[PDB]
Design a protein around this nucleic acid. Structure first.
Length: 219
RNA sequence: AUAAACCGACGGUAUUGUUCAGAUCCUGGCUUGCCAACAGGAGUUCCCCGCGCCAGCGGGG
């Protein structure tokens, strides 16, 4: 049995990116690999130019994300999408200089009434220990948020720690149970995969490599 | 420090003018509130005081 660090990602608004080079900023259904690394990298004091420990975090940690349905008054509330018409005045026209446009337009998608429970474990050749990752989520250095800085948390990042055989068995200890799980480690009775391009290329800033979740449906 | 960061969707604007709800219409007939009754019992009133026969009588609060 390995040690797991259990996290809770809850808030009225979330955003988990999909590939884009456009003014449209799309969200997926559950947290990304890159987004979870960034969240951890925020709790730790990692700066954007520190590629060394940026790569040390990525090589040390793997995730498992469970989608949690909001239950209210014994009624189920579904996750909905939200489109924000987001404008910027005096936005940069070039990457150097002070010339700017009057108005630019962007379109940003959010999730509403979404909540997630994240299982976290160490790779066989990890650098850090779950003990110091626990410290980081309890006392973050940079401000933690759900995808975008405008999206605060309504529940503490830290949920618990535990020991278990597989990520599914670990997430079982924490209500609410029943949601679909996406894991970096495969579990025995499941064979479905979820393709994604959310593996941050750390040697190539703001670029992403293809990878795959192992899909584990809830009962 | 997360397709992240930095980041307004903005600015102007009467809903206006006209218009009876109106005519007709008993709530109405019947019906004891009635039988019994001393307002008498019971001297606690806590003081100061003055004069006694010691029983009890007075003036001040």
């Amino acid at each position: 049995m390995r040690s797991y660090l259990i996290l809770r990602l809850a808030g009225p608004m979330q955003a988990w990116g999909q590939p884009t080079f456009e003014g449209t900023r799309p969200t997926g259904r559950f947290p990304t690999r890159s987004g979870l690394l960034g969240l951890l990298g925020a709790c730790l004091g990692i700066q954007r130019d520190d590629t060394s420990s940026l790569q040390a975090l990525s090589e040390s940690v793997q995730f498992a994300v469970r989608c949690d349905e909001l239950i209210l008054d014994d009624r189920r509330v579904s996750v909905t999408g939200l489109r924000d018409y987001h404008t910027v005045l005096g936005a940069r026209e070039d990457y150097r200089g002070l010339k700017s446009h009057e108005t630019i337009q962007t379109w940003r998608e959010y999730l509403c009434d979404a909540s997630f429970t994240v299982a976290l474990w160490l790779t066989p050749h990890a650098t850090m220990v779950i003990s110091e990752l626990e410290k980081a989520v309890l006392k973050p250095r940079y401000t933690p948020y759900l995808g975008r800085r405008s999206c605060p948390l309504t529940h503490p990042l830290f949920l618990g720690t535990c020991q278990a055989s597989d990520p599914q068995k670990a997430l079982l200890n924490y209500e609410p149970v029943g949601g679909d799980i996406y894991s970096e480690e495969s579990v025995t009775g499941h064979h479905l995969k979820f393709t994604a391009r959310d593996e941050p290329m750390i040697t190539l800033p703001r670029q992403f490599a293809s990878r795959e979740w192992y899909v584990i449906k809830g009962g």
